[PDB]
Every structure is written in C-alpha cells, then in structure tokens.
C-alpha cells in the first residue's frame, strides 16, 4: 500500500511527510496525540530560523497546515509494533494495521516531570527542561537545576554563563555524572549544591517564579529559597516502545542510525529526538526529517 | 579575539551564528555579499517547515533580522585564507585579518548557469536548478532537463513523477552518468533524449516559458520545441577556494566533515551546501548550522 509511513507528527515527522508527499510518495502520517509533539508544550521559541519569536503551538499549526494539500494522509494511530516482511513492512496500531514499503520513525523523547505543584503553572514562566532553549532568559538570576546525572551537571555548567548563580539540587549525597563533568562542576565557583533534597513546590506570582520549597529526604527538613528559574533533569527517555525487539536501539532504547537516518533495517529510518544523538532541537529535527525523506524515496525507487 | 567566526551568511551560517551568539560565544559572521546566500536567487520556497510559502529574499530577511539583537557581530569580508595556529586560527580577508578560537565554514555552492537569453527572465517562471525544490510546480508538463551526468539523469528520473514527459538534452552523443543510473533512464519511457545539442534561448510570454530554441553542435541545425519548464545541471561547484590547501576537501573540492560537522582540523567545522554530502536544502543547512554551533561551543569550552 503506502510508499512510506511516518510515525509521529512532531517537527521531524511533519518535515519528513512534507517531503515525501511533495515528492509524490504515497504517504501516511500516524499520530497518537496532537500534531506538533513537544512543540505543543513549549511557549516562546527563539531559535527556529525564520521566526524571531514564535509560540510552540503556533509553530505546530504552521508546520501541520500544508500537509493535507501536499497529499499527506493524516491518520490516528498508537503504533504498538512493526513487522518486516522484506518487500514490505507491517505497522500495527491498537485497532489497525498498515502495509508500507518504508517507515520513518519520528516518535521523539520524553522529559520526566517533577509532578509538584507549580511546575505546570510556571512552565515557560521560569520552569524549563532545556538550557540551550531557555537559559538566555535568566541572565543574572539565581538559577536552580534539579538532577545529578550528566545532563543536570552539564546544563548547570552551561547555565552559569547566564545566571548569577546556579544551584544543583539532587536527591542523593553525591552525583552520578561522569567524573570529568563532575570535576568541571567542583571547579566552577558559581555552582553550589543542595544534597539529599527534592523540590516540593515551585512558587511565584501570577507572572513568574519567585521561590522553591524543598525537603531533605533524610531529615524531613523543609526550606524555601528564592530562585528566578528552574531547569529540570530527572530523566529523558526515548519514545520507541514499539521497536524494542527489532535490534535497532541502544542500551537506553535510543534508535541507532547512520548519518543518512538509516537504521540497520533496510527501509526503516528514524529521525529527530528518538535517535541516539546529542543535540535535540527543532532545527536538527527538521534537518533529520528532510534527510530521511530523501532516503526513503531512494529506497522505494530501487 | 572571537570565540567563533562563521564564514558565510546563508541559512547554514545564519543558524550557526544565531546559536553561538545565544550561547554567549563571542561571535563574528562574515559575508562578502547579501545575507541569505542562494535563498536570494530563489522565488517561492514551499518546503521550509513553518512557512507554507515564502519568497527566498523574504526568508533571508527573517533569518538575518534577529542576529544583531542576539549579539552576532556582522562584518563585511571576502575571505581568502585561513591559518591554523593551534590555540587560535587566523582568517585573512582581502583587506583584513581576524583571530578566533574556532571557525564554522558556511560558504555554500554554485549552480553553473547556461548564460543564454531567457534563463534569467524566466528564473522561477519555468527555469530551475533543483527538482526536489521545484518539480512539484510542473505536473503533467513537457519538461526539459539539461546535462548528461548523474545529477541531470537522476533529477530527470525524479521529474517524471510530475511531468507528462521529460527530455534530457546533452551536448555530447552519450552520457557521463553512472551505468546504473543510465540503465534506469533508458528503461523509463517518459524520458527521451536530444543529443549533441545545447539550448540557445528559452522563450515564453510575460508570465511563463513556452519554448526552448536549441542547436546541434555538430550540425549547426537549430530547433524550437514547446516546453513548460527547464531544469539545468551543467555543473555544481563548492564555493571554498580559501581552504584548498588545508587538506580538508575531497576531489571536487567539497569540504569533508564527520556527522558533527567537524573537519579534520580541530576547531574548524563546515556546514550546509559547502560540505561533501548528498542532500542540499535549507532544512539540512539549518540542521547543519545548529549542530556545528553546539560542537564549536564544546571545542571552545575544553
Ligand atoms: C518544554 C520544551 C521546550 C523546548 N524548546 C525548544 C526550543 O526553544 N527550540 C528548540 O529547538 N527545541 C526545543 N525543544 C526541543 C524540541 O521540542 C524537540 O527537539 C523536537 O520537538 C523533536 O521533534 P520530534 O519530531 O523528533 O519529536 P516530538 O516533537 O517529541 O514528537 C514526536 C511525536 O510522536 C508521537 N508518537 C510517539 N509515539 C508514538 C506511537 N507509538 N504512535 C504514534 N505516534 C507516536 C507523539 O505524540 C509526538 O507527537 C523543547 C522541548 C521541550 C520539552
Ligand atoms: C534557484 C534555487 C532555488 C532553491 N530552492 C530551494 C527550495 O525551494 N527549498 C530548499 O530547501 N532549498 C532550495 N535551494 C537550496 C538552498 O538555497 C541551499 O541549500 C541553501 O541556500 C544553502 O545554504 P548555505 O547556508 O550552506 O549556503 P548559501 O545559501 O550558498 O550561502 C553561502 C554564503 O556564503 C557567502 N560566502 C561565500 N564565500 C565567501 C567568502 N569567501 N567570504 C565571505 N562570504 C562568503 C556567500 O555570499 C553566500 O552568501 C535552492 C537553491 C537555488 C540556487
């Protein structure tokens, strides 16, 4: 049936579908939630070339709008599995099955949340999950980072280029980050640490964050401190449950591809945040989605 | 002096500069011409996610406009050389020199022109140099492709998915393209050939192309035929004369990088159309630029 099925309608998948459909490939775009993916949980985006500033859901609409006129068949699907039959592959959703010559997996990643009062309320008003994205908004402020792995500590060091101070709050008494990243953190004076502690409530006014209430997990001692921003790194997971058995993922479950977005399965490509890679952004998601589209064309051709 | 100098203000270099500046790297963007690069010679762009349609020069302006407010220093420079000195590199322009810790080369490519009457007049009114970019505009039309290499013939093949027919006109009596590509052309019935011929004039009305006059280079014999669009592939060159002696280029002079945009010289990255790669688009230029900015940041930190 399909020349190509794209799983996931975030920026990578919409870019790939735009391409494949424009190139007259019979194109299906599957989505279990809402077009735009993680962009839908974003306020101001200032690093997508072409818009000085644009809101996440605005950009989601902009990217989705042309797809139907270009021929993309949009369809609801919560993809649970994929079978390769050589000449074709089968995609299994909760109520359906699709046959296709090629597959572009574009199902993204999930940023684990704190799930404390205030987190949602102040999302893009002080709460963030990405320093490259948002760090710039907090020049000379007191910045709080939550987490103790490579990500928390690396983004903390990055954020010391903006904040007056960066504080790392971790639930244990030492860090899980690599030694070299740790060494950098201990040498940087603008960083300090709050150990054995977890946040309880993110507080502020109607407009922006003003403080964080936190608790020492060993002692029970509760404390409130002023902070102007909170960056959260309590885990980042691939969203690729439906490929777990296919042999195309790494330890943590990221999809391995070559520079051409090809997985080790012929006709199966992956793009965007779901890939094993080190820079997760709209721009790199778009770049990936265009590349995979060209490769899927080529594959379907030969 | 600088943390990073981006050479070239096309989409790849503008995205890179935007990223480095936002990350507080002391950032210079050098450009000999007009910001936007090849986007300035483009009419409608329909495959840059975020815009259903936008004019090349309009996109250029949207991408250039934020750069100064983010801290990019724009400066005029026709770059002629680069010296690596280990800790720093020197960039030589016709009338100046700059010192920098790192360099992102973003100098693009040049599509060679026919230089015949009508080529400019019907640029984006039937004259094109990129089938993935423009083919969609010629469904069911008589399409003419100029050139005899891998690019002409692969784009011709691609274009048969829109046009009623596709004629390849080559100046010699047989093709330079790979045998496999040639076999595919020969087997595709919507392709035919005009040999030992070159175009002389592209003609039409005030809006669009209606015909092409051409000449048999052996016989002198002239012909006019009706065509609705013309796609030109008489050569594509890197624009990177200022690196020719640095050991970072391939046979044809494309800059070789890894998947992180790294050249074999530390602190020297390259992005976008100038790179050796297979898919030249704004999307992939933007993806490249973002990635290199993040690599430059990392290079400059350690
Ligand atoms: C709060 C926040 C702010 C951000 N700000 C910025 C910024 O300012 N600039 C920037 O460049 N980047 C930003 N990012 C990063 C950017 O949003 C991501 O890099 C980008 O969205 C990745 O796109 P994607 O297409 O790979 O995946 P995603 O956008 O995650 O979308 C994947 C899609 O796949 C769908 N899907 C998943 N599994 C299935 C399944 N089994 N079946 C069907 N559908 C499925 C999901 O619902 C989803 O819609 C931000 C991220 C967050 C969380
Ligand atoms: C007619 C046409 C139509 C196109 N249509 C589309 C489309 O619809 N969609 C799409 O995705 N892509 C399209 N493309 C391709 C797209 O324009 C390119 O992929 C993109 O512009 C390349 O980005 P870049 O930043 O790598 O280089 P470029 O855009 O080439 O920019 C390089 C810049 O570097 C500057 N420079 C070069 N040398 C030096 C030097 N020595 N010193 C200082 N500055 C220097 C140049 O002045 C130039 O401004 C089109 C291209 C053309 C020619």
Author numbering:
A (entry chain B), B (entry chain A): 5 to 306
Task: Quote the study on this structure.
The LlTrxR structures were obtained mainly in the FR conformation, which was unexpected since all available structures of LMW TrxR from other organisms are in the FO conformation, except for the engineered complex between EcTrxR and EcTrx6. LlTrxR crystallized in the FO conformation only under reducing conditions in the presence of DTT. Superposition of LlTrxR Cα-atoms with the structure of EcTrxR36, gives RMSD of 0.426 Å and 1.137 Å for the enzymes in FR and FO conformation, respectively. The relative orientation of the structures thus matches perfectly with the E. coli enzyme and consolidates the catalytic model proposed by Waksman et al. (1994) where the NADPH domain rotates 66° relative to the FAD domain in order to switch between the FO and FR conformations in the catalytic cycle. In the FO conformation, Tyr237 is distant from the flavin-binding site and another tyrosine (Tyr133) is in proximity to the isoalloxazine ring (4.9 Å from C7α), but no indications of oxidation of Tyr133 were observed in the irradiated structures of LlTrxR. The re-face of the isoalloxazine ring in the FO conformation is occupied by the Cys134-Cys137 disulfide while in the FR conformation it is surrounded by hydrophilic residues (Asp154, Glu158, Ser155 and Gln285). In the space between the β-carbon of Met43 and the isoalloxazine ring (7.2–7.4 Å distance to N10 and N5) a well-defined electron density appears, assigned to a water molecule perfectly centered above the central ring of the isoalloxazine. This water molecule is present in all structures listed in Table 1.
